[PDB]
Amino acid sequence: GSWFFGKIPRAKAEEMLSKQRHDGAFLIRESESAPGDFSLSVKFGNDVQHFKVLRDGAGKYFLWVVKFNSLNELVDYHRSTSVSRNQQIFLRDIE
């Protein structure tokens, strides 16, 4: 399951992830018109929830609190740690 999709629409990201069989199924998309402005599109339960990945300076990526140097480091941290702080919900690969 290949997670990175360079720059595709918000409606096309919601259509592909709602069809997927896996709980936690995600893709990281770039926002349409804004360069270097990312969004983690991740299915939590049944709804595809778009958490904004902001950039601090050079090569840095922060959505939750602490910054993550690469987009692969942002994925592998929240694959075991929770994004939504109540029930534990993690990042799983697409079909």
Curated annotation (Swiss-Prot):
GO CC terms: cell cortex; cell-cell junction; centrosome; COP9 signalosome; cytoplasm; cytosol; endosome; extracellular exosome
Keyword Mitochondrion: no
Origin superkingdom: Eukaryota
Keyword annotations: Acetylation, Cytoplasm, Endosome, Golgi apparatus, Host-virus interaction, Isopeptide bond, Nucleus, Phosphoprotein, Repeat, SH2 domain, SH3 domain, Ubl conjugation
Residue numbers of N6-acetyllysine PTMs: K52
Record bears the keyword Cytoplasm: yes
Cross-link (Glycyl lysine isopeptide (Lys-Gly) (interchain with G-Cter in ubiquitin)), chain numbering: K52
Compartments in which it is found: Nucleus; Cytoplasm; Endosome; Golgi apparatus
Result for mutant: V66P: Strong loss of clustering of phospho-LAT at the T-cell plasma membrane
GO biological process: actin cytoskeleton organization; B cell receptor signaling pathway; branching involved in labyrinthine layer morphogenesis; cellular response to ionizing radiation; endodermal cell differentiation; epidermal growth factor receptor signaling pathway; fibroblast growth factor receptor signaling pathway; insulin receptor signaling pathway
PTM entry text: Ubiquitinated by RNF173, leading to proteasomal degradation and inhibition of the RAF/MEK/ERK pathway. In the nucleus, polyubiquitinated by RBBP6 at Lys-52 at DNA damage sites.
Limits of the SH2 domain: 3-95
Effect annotated for changing K52R: Loss of polyubiquitination
GO molecular function, one term: identical protein binding
Task of the protein: Non-enzymatic adapter protein that plays a pivotal role in precisely regulated signaling cascades from cell surface receptors to cellular responses, including signaling transduction and gene expression. Thus, participates in many biological processes including regulation of innate and adaptive immunity, autophagy, DNA repair or necroptosis. Controls signaling complexes at the T-cell antigen receptor to facilitate the activation, differentiation, and function of T-cells.
Protein family per UniProt: Belongs to the GRB2/sem-5/DRK family.
Domain comment as written in the entry: The SH3 domains mediate interaction with RALGPS1 and SHB.
Assembly information from the UniProt record: Homodimer. Associates (via SH2 domain) with activated EGF and PDGF receptors (tyrosine phosphorylated). Interacts with PDGFRA (tyrosine phosphorylated); the interaction may be indirect. Also associates to other cellular Tyr-phosphorylated proteins such as SIT1, IRS1, IRS2, IRS4, SHC and LNK; probably via the concerted action of both its SH2 and SH3 domains. It also seems to interact with RAS in the signaling pathway leading to DNA synthesis. Interacts with SOS1. Forms a complex with MUC1 and SOS1, through interaction of the SH3 domains with SOS1 and the SH2 domain with phosphorylated MUC1. (Microbial infection) Interacts (via SH3 domain) with hepatitis E virus/HEV ORF3 protein.
Protein name: Growth factor receptor-bound protein 2
